[PDB]
Amino acid sequence: INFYKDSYAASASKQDFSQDPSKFTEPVVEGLKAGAPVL
Amino acid sequence: INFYKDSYAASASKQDFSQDPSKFTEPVVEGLKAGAPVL
Amino acid sequence: IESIIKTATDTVKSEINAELGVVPSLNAVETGATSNTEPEEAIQTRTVINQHGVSETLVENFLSRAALVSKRSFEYKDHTSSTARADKNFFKWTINTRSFVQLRRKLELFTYLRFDAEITILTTVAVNGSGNNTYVGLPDLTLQAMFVPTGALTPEKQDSFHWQSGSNASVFFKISDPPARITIPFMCINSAYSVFYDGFAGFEKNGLYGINPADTIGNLCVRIVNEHQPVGFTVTVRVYMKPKHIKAWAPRPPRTLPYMSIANANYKGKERAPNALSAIIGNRDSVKTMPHNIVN
Amino acid sequence: IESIIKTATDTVKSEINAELGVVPSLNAVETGATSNTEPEEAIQTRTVINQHGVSETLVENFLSRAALVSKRSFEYKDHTSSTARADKNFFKWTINTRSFVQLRRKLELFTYLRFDAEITILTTVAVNGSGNNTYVGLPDLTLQAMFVPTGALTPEKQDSFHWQSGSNASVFFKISDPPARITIPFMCINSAYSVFYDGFAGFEKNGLYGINPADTIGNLCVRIVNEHQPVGFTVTVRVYMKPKHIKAWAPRPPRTLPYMSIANANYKGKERAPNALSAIIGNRDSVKTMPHNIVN
Amino acid sequence: SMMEINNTESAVGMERLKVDISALTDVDQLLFNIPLDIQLDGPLRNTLVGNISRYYTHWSGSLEMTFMFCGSFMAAGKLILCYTPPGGSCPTTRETAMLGTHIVWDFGLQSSVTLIIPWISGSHYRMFNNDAKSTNANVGYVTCFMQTNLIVPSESSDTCSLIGFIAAKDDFSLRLMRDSPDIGQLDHLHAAEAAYQ
Amino acid sequence: SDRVLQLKLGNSAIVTQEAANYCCAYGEWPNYLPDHEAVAIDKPTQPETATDRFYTLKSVKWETGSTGWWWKLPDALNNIGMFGQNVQHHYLYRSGFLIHVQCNATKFHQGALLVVAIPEHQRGAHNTNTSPGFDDIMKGEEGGTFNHPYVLDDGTSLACATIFPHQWINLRTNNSATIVLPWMNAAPMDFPLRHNQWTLAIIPVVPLGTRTTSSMVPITVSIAPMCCEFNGLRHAIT
Amino acid sequence: SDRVLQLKLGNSAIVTQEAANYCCAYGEWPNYLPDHEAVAIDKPTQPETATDRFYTLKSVKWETGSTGWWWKLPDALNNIGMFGQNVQHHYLYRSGFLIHVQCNATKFHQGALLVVAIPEHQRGAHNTNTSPGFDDIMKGEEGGTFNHPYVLDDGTSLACATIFPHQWINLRTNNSATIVLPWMNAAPMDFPLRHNQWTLAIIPVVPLGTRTTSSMVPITVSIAPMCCEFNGLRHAIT
């Protein structure tokens, strides 16, 4: 229920379930395969 | 939301984006071209 | 020509210009036109996509703000022994927009205005110190605000029969209620209000200059409906006005000198700059002096 | 890569692994990557269908909670003989999120934030003990809260004409009303607020480190509209803020040592562990000692 | 709208709206400088763009400064008008000012020249505070130098007036409306009480 | 395969045979400012090879009582070569970075360095309410040292510093670290003399130790600006 | 139509209302060095707007006994702005020029200036067998004056100087001259600190004269490098 003329007056938006943890956990140019020696 | 019978009772109308600055900036009978000497 | 503008204009990239007979930086101010030199023709620019909105500078948004237009304080008490000038539990105010300068200057930024006026009335009450040196509580009082056309008969006392309001619009509101709100339509006999009037509104020579009664919305008569209490109170009524559905014509130079009266545009200016009669802008040492020069 | 995650990941059953050249439990921390060893490769697991939701850890949910950002108490009375420092029926507050530590730490968990701020104002009143040693009742007062941009002219007294609020946004609310609520948009001149600023916001060397005025929402000026009563009261105004429509960038290590000032990240720590400068975590006897060992 | 470049104690009224230029015997001499802020008191304040912009807190976009030469027809001369982006002091020599944005103006049949101050800002908008030296408010400087000289015959006036105007372009925008600091009152106006009589 | 690496920018090249991959900050690569994000309307200058090249700073000595070292970008490079000249002559700056930290020793040496790039590392002062001064923050080419690396000199924790882009130089494993940093600012461009986008911090979590003959073990930092662009040409500020 | 002219390079613009066309040296326009003529194999730096902009030199005074003035390119611009910085930091230079000479007076004034661009103006000395020294040739921003403009200070004739690219500033006709110079060298690039490709010479063939009240009549030179490219990046020589 938003009867105001400004879009920023609306309620909170809690429907963004998109994630990308790799940018914090695997920030390497070359990816690593499972079980293979990384180094 | 306007349930009143008179049209002037409605909320403000902020949806008029039409402009004509030339009537204040170029009020000349003959227009001026870009780069050409005006005088 | 007319066009719909929702964002600021984009910038296009430009290259070196060495064309004979083309001088975009040269202009002729004497024609009265504003210079049309684009940034692309003055310097070398890049491509910029401008997404800055322009909706906050719309005339509707610029003017449709509730601004204080009236503030009146009066004593709610027994007024048998009061003077003639005192407001005996009621007051009458000729509606105008020239009493408070913040809204007046913005309205005077234009020559012609057409709008409906949203009116908000806020009431506050305090216990009078003199006589009743002790505080006993604030009473929830009923107030009547009656719209009376300019020049028509206004009530002469709190219990006047004119308050019956057979045809006059009246609003009754409590102090504990939210501020009372009504909408007065655009009521000028002309197609727009005259913010400035270079003439006299009378057929003789003894009239008032600059005052057009066709531009006066009317009179607001505000009374306390309740009869007086054994103790006295001070009641302050604040009237706020918000223009809406606004059309504006012929923008004007803004007011620089302080206002003197609500009846004319008389000017005196401050004693010294800024906003003095001989110097609007504050002085600096010389035209070669930078007021806020960065020195490291 | 980007993916939509609504529940925790399922577990797949695994068998005995005796493969040469495959060492999923060995990692290289020096690369800076987090270990990718799955539970399926470390032990033998079963099949588990995980239905646990992850919506409570959403950044919007994590931050869109109304938290106290301001608490100001002032005396509502006759202030003719008051001192210059005292709040004479009104106060002005520079809006910030660094005064109360619970919201400040959560906001400082990130480097960049973009959000609109929902502002809630709650007013309480008490009868002043000194002078009026007796209780007579709580008055229903009207308060005005005016938003003034950072650095602009703020009112200097309760009855200042600056309160007319020609263009400034103002909200009038009663104490008996529910707490007043407004929404301030995301108003930074940049695309996001800078929670931490490694620089100086002035072109000279005498500026303030870490303080970017572009990240200050503005000023809130709160006054009692009613004129003073014959007796004095104490009025407490609480301002709560709730971020909404939040975007967050570059999460940061959480604050460990107690905050010292709202103007910087100066640190001292507690006298002893926990949260001491030399020992964040509370001590134990040795690395071979279990703090809460079960002994039966 | 006209700038009040000559905002000095020696200039009264209309004399504040023009800048006097005379013949000099030294080369590369500075004539005048114009500060940057349209949200602060100065030559740009009492202009249409300045007055409207002081109703708001945030501004963006390019400006244009138009100078009209009001000397005699026999008066000749060349000037240089330079916009300097912020960061350092206002240039005091032509060799330093010409390194920034500039236009060389030659007097002739076209009596007006335009220097464009392009929007060169790190942030999308510039905001107003009471700190003129902030990195979110400072725009730079404008300086005027003689390119060659002002040369007039014996029967022409040896002092000639320039008139400066400033305007905003169509990429200009304003945000965060606020009460204007250019008007105020400390008491009720005259005849305001008569409205209650 | 991923132990050797060659980085070639402009006329500068660096080869390492004991690298451990390399880190791209938040999985991003530096790029020029696009039109749909640009603000300044003047045509920028892009020196390319003249400024997008490795600059080697003065080496620091890894000691037993070392607490760590830090440099601030773009402050550390603001007076070096054509990049410094462009910074001094322009009001607005934008670029990313490529950081290469070098430290070699013998197979009998042990020690671990956390090499972390911190965005907007706003430093706090110890045991005082006064904010750090200009001289405490702007150190230039020399850089500064950590007063309390345990709290990253800002009241946070060093243990949680891995949330930032980082690598480790472990003497038994690798002798170099490489971090690629994109432009990281709330604004598309910034004034390079008053704000620092990045802070490179090298902290010896595991102290240097060995029982061989003691030798000086220096740490060297080479920083290459990437996708440099400058706006607002005027006289040099210096 | 051909009396007015606007030249816009970088962030600099010049307008003139009393021009007399303008001269392109030998009917050529400046351009970057093509691959089929390139020699140096390193990637050049092309600052574009940072260096391809008008630089205004110090004005000189036209007197009754004036013999003429000269400046040498690229020597005169070798220590001005980003062009000077690029010259100091690079071993090899290549660019053309756009020269604009300004001189205005009243309609009662008379005088003619020959504004001529001379390629490889090797100067000779008067009444001696010794070659001119380094300080006699390299004057920098200030430039020099003509000892014997009648022979162009080199034993040739001023009357035949019109074979070089040139214009005239005649006070009754025009107040400015504009010459466009391409790259003019035997080699594709050159060391900018030891060789001068061009010499701008302004010679008052007809002396300045009038019977009005005497006023100072200066001559101003604005030179814009064009299609600048620099090779061989190293430390600044200055």
mmCIF file of N, CA, C and O in Angstrom, chain C residues 78-116:
data_model
loop_
_atom_site.group_PDB
_atom_site.id
_atom_site.type_symbol
_atom_site.label_atom_id
_atom_site.label_comp_id
_atom_site.label_asym_id
_atom_site.label_seq_id
_atom_site.Cartn_x
_atom_site.Cartn_y
_atom_site.Cartn_z
ATOM 1 N N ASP C 78 -12.879 36.369 30.142
ATOM 2 C CA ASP C 78 -13.985 37.309 30.281
ATOM 3 C C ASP C 78 -13.528 38.682 29.799
ATOM 4 O O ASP C 78 -12.536 39.222 30.299
ATOM 5 N N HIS C 79 -14.253 39.248 28.834
ATOM 6 C CA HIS C 79 -13.847 40.479 28.166
ATOM 7 C C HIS C 79 -14.816 41.632 28.417
ATOM 8 O O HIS C 79 -14.960 42.520 27.575
ATOM 9 N N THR C 80 -15.496 41.630 29.567
ATOM 10 C CA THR C 80 -16.410 42.726 29.878
ATOM 11 C C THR C 80 -15.662 44.041 30.057
ATOM 12 O O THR C 80 -16.135 45.097 29.620
ATOM 13 N N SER C 81 -14.492 44.000 30.695
ATOM 14 C CA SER C 81 -13.717 45.198 30.991
ATOM 15 C C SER C 81 -12.548 45.394 30.031
ATOM 16 O O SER C 81 -11.662 46.212 30.299
ATOM 17 N N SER C 82 -12.525 44.664 28.920
ATOM 18 C CA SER C 82 -11.438 44.789 27.962
ATOM 19 C C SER C 82 -11.587 46.065 27.138
ATOM 20 O O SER C 82 -12.650 46.689 27.090
ATOM 21 N N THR C 83 -10.494 46.449 26.483
ATOM 22 C CA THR C 83 -10.493 47.623 25.628
ATOM 23 C C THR C 83 -11.135 47.303 24.279
ATOM 24 O O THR C 83 -11.393 46.146 23.938
ATOM 25 N N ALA C 84 -11.400 48.359 23.507
ATOM 26 C CA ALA C 84 -12.043 48.183 22.209
ATOM 27 C C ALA C 84 -11.116 47.517 21.201
ATOM 28 O O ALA C 84 -11.579 46.757 20.344
ATOM 29 N N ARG C 85 -9.810 47.788 21.282
ATOM 30 C CA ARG C 85 -8.870 47.230 20.318
ATOM 31 C C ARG C 85 -8.603 45.748 20.549
ATOM 32 O O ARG C 85 -8.223 45.047 19.605
ATOM 33 N N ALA C 86 -8.786 45.261 21.773
ATOM 34 C CA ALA C 86 -8.477 43.874 22.088
ATOM 35 C C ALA C 86 -9.411 42.920 21.351
ATOM 36 O O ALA C 86 -10.580 43.225 21.101
ATOM 37 N N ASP C 87 -8.876 41.753 20.999
ATOM 38 C CA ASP C 87 -9.662 40.696 20.370
ATOM 39 C C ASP C 87 -10.429 39.951 21.456
ATOM 40 O O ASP C 87 -9.838 39.205 22.244
ATOM 41 N N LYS C 88 -11.745 40.148 21.499
ATOM 42 C CA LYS C 88 -12.587 39.565 22.544
ATOM 43 C C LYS C 88 -13.038 38.183 22.089
ATOM 44 O O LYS C 88 -14.114 38.014 21.514
ATOM 45 N N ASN C 89 -12.192 37.185 22.342
ATOM 46 C CA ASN C 89 -12.445 35.774 22.060
ATOM 47 C C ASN C 89 -12.588 35.476 20.573
ATOM 48 O O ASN C 89 -12.934 34.348 20.205
ATOM 49 N N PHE C 90 -12.332 36.451 19.706
ATOM 50 C CA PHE C 90 -12.452 36.242 18.271
ATOM 51 C C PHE C 90 -11.617 37.290 17.554
ATOM 52 O O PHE C 90 -11.301 38.345 18.110
ATOM 53 N N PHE C 91 -11.265 36.984 16.308
ATOM 54 C CA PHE C 91 -10.545 37.928 15.469
ATOM 55 C C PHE C 91 -10.970 37.751 14.020
ATOM 56 O O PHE C 91 -11.541 36.727 13.633
ATOM 57 N N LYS C 92 -10.712 38.786 13.230
ATOM 58 C CA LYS C 92 -10.953 38.782 11.796
ATOM 59 C C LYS C 92 -9.666 39.172 11.085
ATOM 60 O O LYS C 92 -8.978 40.106 11.505
ATOM 61 N N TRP C 93 -9.338 38.455 10.014
ATOM 62 C CA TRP C 93 -8.104 38.686 9.275
ATOM 63 C C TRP C 93 -8.410 38.754 7.788
ATOM 64 O O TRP C 93 -9.017 37.832 7.235
ATOM 65 N N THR C 94 -7.987 39.837 7.144
ATOM 66 C CA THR C 94 -8.062 39.936 5.693
ATOM 67 C C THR C 94 -6.954 39.081 5.089
ATOM 68 O O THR C 94 -5.769 39.328 5.335
ATOM 69 N N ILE C 95 -7.339 38.077 4.303
ATOM 70 C CA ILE C 95 -6.372 37.121 3.779
ATOM 71 C C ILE C 95 -5.426 37.823 2.815
ATOM 72 O O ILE C 95 -5.859 38.518 1.886
ATOM 73 N N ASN C 96 -4.127 37.648 3.038
ATOM 74 C CA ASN C 96 -3.105 38.183 2.152
ATOM 75 C C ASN C 96 -1.876 37.292 2.242
ATOM 76 O O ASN C 96 -1.734 36.483 3.163
ATOM 77 N N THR C 97 -0.984 37.442 1.263
ATOM 78 C CA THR C 97 0.241 36.655 1.195
ATOM 79 C C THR C 97 1.486 37.522 1.330
ATOM 80 O O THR C 97 2.586 37.082 0.982
ATOM 81 N N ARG C 98 1.338 38.745 1.833
ATOM 82 C CA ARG C 98 2.429 39.707 1.881
ATOM 83 C C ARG C 98 2.929 39.967 3.296
ATOM 84 O O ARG C 98 3.780 40.839 3.489
ATOM 85 N N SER C 99 2.430 39.229 4.287
ATOM 86 C CA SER C 99 2.817 39.462 5.673
ATOM 87 C C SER C 99 4.107 38.743 6.048
ATOM 88 O O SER C 99 4.914 39.284 6.813
ATOM 89 N N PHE C 100 4.319 37.539 5.530
ATOM 90 C CA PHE C 100 5.530 36.772 5.787
ATOM 91 C C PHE C 100 6.357 36.708 4.510
ATOM 92 O O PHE C 100 5.841 36.348 3.448
ATOM 93 N N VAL C 101 7.638 37.057 4.625
ATOM 94 C CA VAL C 101 8.421 37.419 3.449
ATOM 95 C C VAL C 101 8.870 36.201 2.648
ATOM 96 O O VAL C 101 9.095 36.309 1.436
ATOM 97 N N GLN C 102 9.013 35.037 3.284
ATOM 98 C CA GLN C 102 9.533 33.875 2.568
ATOM 99 C C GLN C 102 8.588 33.435 1.455
ATOM 100 O O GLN C 102 9.030 33.142 0.339
ATOM 101 N N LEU C 103 7.285 33.382 1.736
ATOM 102 C CA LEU C 103 6.328 33.057 0.683
ATOM 103 C C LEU C 103 6.101 34.246 -0.241
ATOM 104 O O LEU C 103 5.881 34.070 -1.446
ATOM 105 N N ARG C 104 6.133 35.462 0.309
ATOM 106 C CA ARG C 104 5.852 36.649 -0.490
ATOM 107 C C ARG C 104 6.876 36.825 -1.602
ATOM 108 O O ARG C 104 6.514 37.136 -2.741
ATOM 109 N N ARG C 105 8.159 36.627 -1.295
ATOM 110 C CA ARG C 105 9.197 36.776 -2.312
ATOM 111 C C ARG C 105 9.048 35.730 -3.412
ATOM 112 O O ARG C 105 9.169 36.046 -4.605
ATOM 113 N N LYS C 106 8.774 34.480 -3.031
ATOM 114 C CA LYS C 106 8.587 33.426 -4.022
ATOM 115 C C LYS C 106 7.383 33.711 -4.912
ATOM 116 O O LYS C 106 7.433 33.488 -6.127
ATOM 117 N N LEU C 107 6.289 34.201 -4.324
ATOM 118 C CA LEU C 107 5.120 34.548 -5.123
ATOM 119 C C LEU C 107 5.393 35.745 -6.023
ATOM 120 O O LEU C 107 4.878 35.807 -7.144
ATOM 121 N N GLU C 108 6.198 36.698 -5.555
ATOM 122 C CA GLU C 108 6.545 37.881 -6.327
ATOM 123 C C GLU C 108 7.630 37.611 -7.358
ATOM 124 O O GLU C 108 7.959 38.510 -8.138
ATOM 125 N N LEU C 109 8.195 36.403 -7.376
ATOM 126 C CA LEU C 109 9.042 35.994 -8.491
ATOM 127 C C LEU C 109 8.284 35.926 -9.814
ATOM 128 O O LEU C 109 8.912 35.700 -10.853
ATOM 129 N N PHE C 110 6.966 36.110 -9.802
ATOM 130 C CA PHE C 110 6.144 36.025 -10.999
ATOM 131 C C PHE C 110 5.217 37.230 -11.069
ATOM 132 O O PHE C 110 4.939 37.887 -10.063
ATOM 133 N N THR C 111 4.740 37.517 -12.279
ATOM 134 C CA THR C 111 3.792 38.605 -12.480
ATOM 135 C C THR C 111 2.346 38.143 -12.363
ATOM 136 O O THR C 111 1.529 38.826 -11.739
ATOM 137 N N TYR C 112 2.006 36.999 -12.953
ATOM 138 C CA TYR C 112 0.634 36.510 -12.926
ATOM 139 C C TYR C 112 0.611 35.089 -12.386
ATOM 140 O O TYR C 112 1.444 34.264 -12.770
ATOM 141 N N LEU C 113 -0.339 34.808 -11.497
ATOM 142 C CA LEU C 113 -0.470 33.496 -10.883
ATOM 143 C C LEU C 113 -1.931 33.074 -10.860
ATOM 144 O O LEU C 113 -2.818 33.888 -10.590
ATOM 145 N N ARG C 114 -2.172 31.798 -11.149
ATOM 146 C CA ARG C 114 -3.497 31.198 -11.028
ATOM 147 C C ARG C 114 -3.366 29.899 -10.247
ATOM 148 O O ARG C 114 -2.664 28.982 -10.684
ATOM 149 N N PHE C 115 -4.034 29.819 -9.099
ATOM 150 C CA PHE C 115 -3.923 28.632 -8.263
ATOM 151 C C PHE C 115 -5.110 28.549 -7.315
ATOM 152 O O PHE C 115 -5.750 29.557 -7.007
ATOM 153 N N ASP C 116 -5.387 27.332 -6.856
ATOM 154 C CA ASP C 116 -6.270 27.107 -5.722
ATOM 155 C C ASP C 116 -5.432 27.098 -4.451
ATOM 156 O O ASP C 116 -4.256 26.729 -4.476
#
